[PDB]
Amino acid sequence: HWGYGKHNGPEHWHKDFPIAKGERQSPVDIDTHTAKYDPSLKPLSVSYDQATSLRILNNGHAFNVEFDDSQDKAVLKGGPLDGTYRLIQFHFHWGSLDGQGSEHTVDKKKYAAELHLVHWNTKYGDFGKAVQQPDGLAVLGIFLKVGSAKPGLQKVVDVLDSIKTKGKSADFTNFDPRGLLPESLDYWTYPGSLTTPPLLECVTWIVLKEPISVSSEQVLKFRKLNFNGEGEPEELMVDNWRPAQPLKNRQIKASFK
Ligand SMILES: S=c1[nH]c2ccccc2s1
Ligand SMILES: [Zn+2]
Pairing between β-strand 113-121 and β-strand 84-94 as defined by DSSP bridges: antiparallel
- Distance in angstroms (rounded) separating the CA atoms of residues 92 and 104: 12
| Amino acid at site 162 | S
Domain residues of the chain, as ranges? 10-254
> Residues 6 or more apart from 231 whose CB is under 8 A from it?
none
Select from 118, 132, 193 the residue to mutate for testing ligand 1; criterion: most ligand atoms less than 8 Å from CB: 118
Angle, CA 205 vertex, CA 21 and CA 217 arms, to 5°: 100
- Determine how many CB atoms are found less than 10 A away from the CB of residue 225: 22
Q: What is the DSSP string of the chain?
A: ---SSTTTSGGGHHHH-GGGGSSS-S--EE-TTT-EE-TTPPPEEEE-TT--EEEEEE-SSSEEEEE--SSS-SEEEETT-SSEEEEEEEEEEE-SSTT---SSEETTBPPSEEEEEEEEEGGGSSHHHHTTSTT-EEEEEEEEEESS--GGGHHHHHHGGGG-SBT-EEE--S--GGGG--S---EEEEEE--SSTT--S-EEEEEESSPEEE-HHHHHHHTTSBSSBTTS---B-----PPP---TT---EES--
- Nearest ligand for residue 103 CA: 2
Select from 61, 59, 85 the least CA-distant residue to 72: 85
| Amino acid at site 25 | Q
116 lines ligand 1 (CB under 6 A): yes
CB 201 within 8 A of CB 133: no
Distance between start and end Cα atoms, the chain: 44
245 lines ligand 1 (CB under 6 A): no
Q: Per the annotation, does 173 bind a ligand?
A: no
- The active-site residue out of 1, 7, 12, 61 is 61
Q: Per the annotation, does 52 bind a ligand?
A: no
Q: How many A from CA of 141 to the centre of ligand 2?
A: 8
What experimental approach yielded this model? X-ray
- Distance in angstroms (rounded) separating the CA atoms of residues 59 and 44: 31
User: How would you classify residue 83: left for phi > 0, otherwise alpha for psi between -120 and 50, otherwise beta?
Assistant: left
- Distance in angstroms (rounded) separating the CA atoms of residues 242 and 151: 27
> Residues 6 or more apart from 77 whose CB is under 8 A from it?
45, 47, 83, 84, 85
| Resolution given for this structure, in angstroms | 1.4
- Distance in angstroms (rounded) separating the CA atoms of residues 223 and 157: 11
- Distance in angstroms (rounded) separating the CA atoms of residues 188 and 25: 16
Select from 139, 142, 143, 206 the residue to mutate for testing ligand 1; criterion: most ligand atoms less than 8 Å from CB: 139
CB 142 within 8 A of CB 208: yes
CB 225 within 8 A of CB 235: no
- Distance in angstroms (rounded) separating the CA atoms of residues 206 and 28: 12
Pairing between β-strand 84-94 and β-strand 75-78 as defined by DSSP bridges: antiparallel
Q: How many A from CA of 116 to the centre of ligand 1?
A: 8
Pick the CATH number of 10-254 from 1.10.10.1200, 3.40.50.720, 3.40.50.300, 3.10.200.10: 3.10.200.10
